[PDB]
Amino acid sequence: TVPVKLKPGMDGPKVKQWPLTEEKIKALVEICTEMEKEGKISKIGPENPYNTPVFAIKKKDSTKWRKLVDFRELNKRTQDAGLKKKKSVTVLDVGDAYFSVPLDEDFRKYTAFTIPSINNETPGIRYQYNVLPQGWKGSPAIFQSSMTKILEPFKKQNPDIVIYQYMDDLYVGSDLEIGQHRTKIEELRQHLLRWGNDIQKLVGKLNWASQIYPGIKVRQLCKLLRGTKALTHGVYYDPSKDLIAEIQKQGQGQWTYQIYQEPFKNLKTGKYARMRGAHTNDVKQLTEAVQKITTESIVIWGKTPKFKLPIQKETWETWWTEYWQATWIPEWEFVNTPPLVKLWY
Amino acid sequence: PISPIETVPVKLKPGMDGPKVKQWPLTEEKIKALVEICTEMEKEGKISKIGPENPYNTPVFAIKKKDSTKWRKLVDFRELNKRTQDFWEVQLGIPHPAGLKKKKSVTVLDVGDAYFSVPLDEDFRKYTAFTIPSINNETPGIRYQYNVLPQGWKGSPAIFQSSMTKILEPFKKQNPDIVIYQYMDDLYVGSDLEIGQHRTKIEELRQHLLRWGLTTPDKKHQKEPPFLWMGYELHPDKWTVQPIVLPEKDSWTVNDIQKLVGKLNWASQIYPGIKVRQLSKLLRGTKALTEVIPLTEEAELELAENREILKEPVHGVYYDPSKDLIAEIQKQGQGQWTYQIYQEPFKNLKTGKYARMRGAHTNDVKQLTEAVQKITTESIVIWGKTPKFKLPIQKETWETWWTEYWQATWIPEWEFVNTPPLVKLWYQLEKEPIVGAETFYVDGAANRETKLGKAGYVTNKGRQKVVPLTNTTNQKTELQAIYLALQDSGLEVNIVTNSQYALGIIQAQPDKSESELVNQIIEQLIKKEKVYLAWVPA
DNA sequence: ATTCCCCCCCTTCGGTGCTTTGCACCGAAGGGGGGG
Ligand SMILES: Nc1ncnc2c1ncn2[C@H]1C[C@H](O)[C@@H](COP(=O)(O)OP(=O)(O)OP(=O)(O)O)O1
Ligand SMILES: [Mg+2]
Numbered sequence: 073t074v075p076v077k078l079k080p081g082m083d084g085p086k087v088k089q090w091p092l093t094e095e096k097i098k099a100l101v102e103i104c105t106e107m108e109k110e111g112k113i114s115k116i117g118p119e120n121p122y123n124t125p126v127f128a129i130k131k132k133d134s135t136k137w138r139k140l141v142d143f144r145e146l147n148k149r150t151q152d153a154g155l156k157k158k159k160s161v162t163v164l165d166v167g168d169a170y171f172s173v174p175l176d177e178d179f180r181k182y183t184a185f186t187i188p189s190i191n192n193e194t195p196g197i198r199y200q201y202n203v204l205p206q207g208w209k210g211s212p213a214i215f216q217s218s219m220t221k222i223l224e225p226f227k228k229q230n231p232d233i234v235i236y237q238y239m240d241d242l243y244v245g246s247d248l249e250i251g252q253h254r255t256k257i258e259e260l261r262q263h264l265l266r267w268g269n270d271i272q273k274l275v276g277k278l279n280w281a282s283q284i285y286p287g288i289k290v291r292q293l294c295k296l297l298r299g300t301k302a303l304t305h306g307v308y309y310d311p312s313k314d315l316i317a318e319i320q321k322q323g324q325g326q327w328t329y330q331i332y333q334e335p336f337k338n339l340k341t342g343k344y345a346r347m348r349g350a351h352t353n354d355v356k357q358l359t360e361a362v363q364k365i366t367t368e369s370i371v372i373w374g375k376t377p378k379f380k381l382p383i384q385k386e387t388w389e390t391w392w393t394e395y396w397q398a399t400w401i402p403e404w405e406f407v408n409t410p411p412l413v414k415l416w417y
Numbered sequence: 418p419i420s421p422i423e424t425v426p427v428k429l430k431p432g433m434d435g436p437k438v439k440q441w442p443l444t445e446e447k448i449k450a451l452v453e454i455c456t457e458m459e460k461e462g463k464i465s466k467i468g469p470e471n472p473y474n475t476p477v478f479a480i481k482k483k484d485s486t487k488w489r490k491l492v493d494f495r496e497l498n499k500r501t502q503d504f505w506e507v508q509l510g511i512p513h514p515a516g517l518k519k520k521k522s523v524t525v526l527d528v529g530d531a532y533f534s535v536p537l538d539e540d541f542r543k544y545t546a547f548t549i550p551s552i553n554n555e556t557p558g559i560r561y562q563y564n565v566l567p568q569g570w571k572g573s574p575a576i577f578q579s580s581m582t583k584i585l586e587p588f589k590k591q592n593p594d595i596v597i598y599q600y601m602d603d604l605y606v607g608s609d610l611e612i613g614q615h616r617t618k619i620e621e622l623r624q625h626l627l628r629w630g631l632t633t634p635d636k637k638h639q640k641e642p643p644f645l646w647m648g649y650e651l652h653p654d655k656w657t658v659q660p661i662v663l664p665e666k667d668s669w670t671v672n673d674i675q676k677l678v679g680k681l682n683w684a685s686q687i688y689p690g691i692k693v694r695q696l697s698k699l700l701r702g703t704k705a706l707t708e709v710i711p712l713t714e715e716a717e718l719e720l721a722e723n724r725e726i727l728k729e730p731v732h733g734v735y736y737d738p739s740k741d742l743i744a745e746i747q748k749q750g751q752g753q754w755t756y757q758i759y760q761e762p763f764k765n766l767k768t769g770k771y772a773r774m775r776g777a778h779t780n781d782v783k784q785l786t787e788a789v790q791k792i793t794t795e796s797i798v799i800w801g802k803t804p805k806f807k808l809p810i811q812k813e814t815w816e817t818w819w820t821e822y823w824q825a826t827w828i829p830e831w832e833f834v835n836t837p838p839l840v841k842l843w844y845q846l847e848k849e850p851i852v853g854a855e856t857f858y859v860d861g862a863a864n865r866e867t868k869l870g871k872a873g874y875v876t877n878k879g880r881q882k883v884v885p886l887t888n889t890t891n892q893k894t895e896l897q898a899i900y901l902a903l904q905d906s907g908l909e910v911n912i913v914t915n916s917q918y919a920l921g922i923i924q925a926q927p928d929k930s931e932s933e934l935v936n937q938i939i940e941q942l943i944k945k946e947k948v949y950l951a952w953v954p955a
Numbered sequence: 956a957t958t959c960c961c962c963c964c965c966t967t968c969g970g971t972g973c974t975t976t977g978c979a980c981c982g983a984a985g986g987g988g989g990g991g
C-alpha cells in the first residue's frame with residue numbers, strides 16, 4: 073500500500089499557481105493553518121522544485137470552503153454495467169477519512185503547493201502533504217486496499233448493486249428510488265469522521281454519411297442541386313483508450329455533447345439546456361455541463377473523459393474555478409475552430 | 418555576524434560536477450576593489466580561504482552598485498547554475514503601489530549585505546570557490562570558498578526570500594496590526610499607530626532582525642515621505658512613478674527605439690492613453706540592433722503625443738476597500754485600447770493599455786473581451802477582486818454577439834458609457850437565404866506546382882466570370898472567388914461557397930486582418946446591405 | 956563583455972494539428988522597461 077512511485081520516465085509536476093481572490097486566499101490560509109496543527113501538511117522551502125496549483129471551492133452545502141489541488145500531473149505520472157440501478161445514481165463524498173493513512177516519505181515531496189498573497193506583499197508560502205491527499209489517483213487504491221473492512225458493515229443484509237468511482241466520491245448503487253431520502257446511511261454516517269437552402273442544408277447533413285455509418289449514397293439527394301436555382305448503438309469502448317467528450321454551443325443556452333472513443337463513432341450523445349438563469353453566465357452552464365458529462369462517464373464507464381471545450385482558454389482559466397463544485401478536475405483542450413458547420417447535431 | 422538561520426540543503430543534478438571555468442582577466446581598478454571587499458569579507462567569515470580541494474573555480478567580476486561609489490562583487494556561476502538542482506521560485510510577482518491603503522505611519526527599511534548574511538550549505542561551499550587574481554601579474558592569487566550565499570547563483574534569490582520570511586514571521590505574529598511588504602530584503606512597514614508610537618516599533622523590528630544578524634543601516638532608513646519605494650515616489654495620500662526621462666536624440670537606432678518603447682510601457686501605468694504601436698512597428702524586420710532607423714511620419718506625431726502626455730505631472734491614489742472598483746475602457750483606434758481603474762472621477766488608481774493582436778482575423782468585440790480578461794486578472798492580482806466595467810459598447814450589440822457565436826464568451830458585471838467611438842459590428846450575415854437575390858456559386862482552385870490558380874463564379878442569369886491569378890494557393894484562391902462575387906453584385910447578393918476555410922474567416926465578422934485579401938473582402942461586405950453565405954459540398 | 960531571480964510588453968521562430976502538406980494557433984525565446 074504505502075510504497076508508491078512515479079511512472080518510469082518522468083519527474084513530477086511543475087505547474088505554476090494562478091492568481092486568486094481574497095475570499096479564496098483567506099479561506100485557504102485558515103484551512104492550511106488548521107491542517108498544519110493536525111499534522112496533515114508541513115511547510116517546505118524552495119529546495120523542493122515541484123508545484124501543483126491550488127484553490128478553494130464552496131461546495132453545495134455552502135457551509136465551509138473546501139480546498140482543492142489541481143492534482144492532474146500527479147495522476148498522469150503515477151503508475152497504478154453494475155450501476156444500471158435507478159438512473160442518476162447519486163452519492164455524497166469520501167475525502168475526510170483519507171487523512172488517516174500517511175503518505176510514503178519518499179513520495180511527499182511531489183505533492184507540493186503554494187499559497188499566493190494579495191498584491192504580492194509576501195513571497196508565497198509552500199506546503200507539502202503528509203497523509204494521502206484528495207485528488208491523487210493512487211490514494212483511493214492505497215486507502216481501499218486496507219480499509220475495505222468497512223465496505224461490508226453498511227451491507228449487513230443489503231444486496232443493493234455495484235458502487236466504486238475514480239477520485240474520492242465513492243458512488244453507491246441503491247435501486248430503491250424511494251425511502252426517507254435513502255435514510256439508510258447509518259454505517260455511511262460512521263467510518264467517515266472517525267476513520268475506523270433546405271435542400272442545401274439537408275445534403276450538408278448527409279455529409280455525415282460513411283463517416284458515422286458506413287454505406288450511404290447521397291446522390292439522388294443532390295439530383296435537385298449543384299446547378300443554377302434561385303436561392304429564394306452497439307458501441308465499442310476498449311478499456312485502455314480514453315473517452316473523448318465534445319461540446320458545441322447551439323445558442324439560447326443550449327449545449328450538445330458527444331462522447332466518442334474513435335472519431336465519428338459516438339458512444340454517447342446528449343443535449344444540456346439551461347435556457348435563461350445563468351443567462352449571460354454561459355461559463356457557468358458549460359462548467360455545469362462539464363460536471364454533468366463527467367459524472368456520467370464515471371457511473372457507466374468509470375474514467376473521466378478528455379473535454380474539447382468550445383470556450384476560449386483565458387475565459388475558462390479565469391472563471392472555471394468559481395463555479396466548480398466537483399472533486400475531480402478532468403483534462404481539457406480548447407476547440408479554436410468553428411464546430412458550427414451547417415446546422416448539424 | 419552570519420545569521421543563525423538554519424541552512425537550506427542544496428545538491429547538484431545527479432551526476433554533474435563543479436565549475437572549473439578559469440578566472441578571466443580583470444582591470445586593476447576592479448582588482449583593487451575586489452581585494453578590498455574580499456579582505457573585509459574574509460575577516461567577517463563571509464569567504465573562507467581555500468586550499469587543495471578539487472580545482473573548482475568560477476570567474477569573478479564587479480560592477481558599480483546603484484548610484485553609490487561602492488562596488489558589487491558578482492560571480493559568473495552560469496556553469497554551476499546549469500548543474501545545480503532546480504528550485505521553485507517563491508516571488509510570484511512585484512508589489513504595486515495602488516493595492517496599498519493610505520496609512521498615517523509608514524517606514525521603508527533595507528537589510529544591508531543581504532545575501533552575504535544568510536549561511537550557505539557547508540556541503541556545497543566547495544563548488545563556489547573563486548580565485549581573486551593578482552594586482553601585479555602572475556602572483557598566485559588568493560582563492561576563497563563562499564560561506565554565505567553568492568551574488569550570482571540561481572538558488573540565492575529563493576533561499577534569501579524564504580529565509581527573510583522565517584525571520585519576519587515571529588514579528589508578524591506579535592504585530593497583526595502592522596503591515597509588512599517584503600520584496601527580497603526591502604521592507605515597507607505601515608500601521609495606523611501614532612508616529613511617536615510607530616517609531617518605537619521600528620526600533621523593535623530592527624532589533625528582531627539584528628538578533629538574526631540582519632543589520633539595517635540608518636543611512637538607507639527612509640523615515641519621512643516622499644518615500645522612494647519600488648521605483649515610486651509615494652507621498653502620504655498620492656503615489657507617482659519616479660521621474661521618467663524619455664531619450665531625446667536625432668538618429669534612432671533599433672536599440673534606442675526598444676528603450677523608448679520600454680520606457681513608454683513603464684510610463685503607461687500612470688500616464689493616460691500612451692501609444693507605442695506606431696513606434697513598435699519600426700522593430701518588425703530589421704534585426705541589426707544598430708541600424709539607424711529613420712523616423713517616419715505616422716510615428717513622429719505619435720511620439721510627440723506621447724511626449725506631451727509626459728509633460729504635465731500625474732499621480733495615482735491609494736486603494737479604499739470601502740468603495741467600488743471601476744474600469745473605463747476606451748478604444749483608441751488601430752487595435753489599441755486604454756483603461757483606467759479608479760474609485761472616484763478624475764482620480765485614478767492605475768492607468769493602462771492593451772494593444773495585442775491575438776489571432777489572424779478578429780473584430781473589436783473579441784479584442785474588447787480580451788482586454789476585459791486582462792484587467793480582470795490584473796485586478797485579481799493587485800486587489801483580489803474583479804472590478805465593474807464601463808465598456809463603450811451597447812448592451813444589445815454584445816447580446817447579439819453572445820447569442821450568435823459558437824464559442825462561450827462572457828464579460829462580468831459591466832455597464833455602457835455613451836462615449837465615442839462605440840465598439841460595433843460593421844455587418845451581419847443572414848440566417849435564411851434572401852428571396853429575390855442573385856445567387857453566386859463561387860469556386861477557385863490552383864495547382865500546387867504551377868502556383869497559378871483560376872477562380873470564378875456561376876450565377877442564375879447568365880453572368881459567368883473566370884479570372885486567373887499567380888502565386889496563389891488552394892485556399893487563397895477560394896477566398897478570392899468570393900471577392901469576385903462581391904465586386905460585381907449589387908446591394909443584395911446570395912453567395913454559395915464550397916470551403917470550410919472561406920466560411921470560418923467570413924463567419925466571424927472580421928473588421929481588420931493582416932491578409933490584404935480578407936481586408937478587401939471586409940471593405941465590400943460593409944458597403945453591401947444584406948449579404949448571405951452558405952456552404953454546399955458540390 | 957561577461958552574473959541571478961520576479962513581473963510586464965513586442966517581435967520572431969519553431970512545434971502542432973487538422974488537412975485544406977498550408978494556415979492558424981501557441982509556447983518559448985531574443986530585445987526592452989521596472990524592481991531587489
Ligand atoms: N545586480 C545584482 N546582481 C545580482 N544580485 C543582485 C543584484 N542586485 C541585487 N541583487 C541581490 C543580492 C543582493 O544582496 C540583494 C539585494 O540587493 P541590494 O539590497 O541592493 O544589495 P545589498 O543589500 O547586498 O547591498 P547594500 O549594502 O547596499 O544594501 O539582491
Ligand atoms: Mg539591502
Ligand SMILES: [Mg+2]
Nearest residue numbers: 527603637991
Ligand atoms: Mg534597495
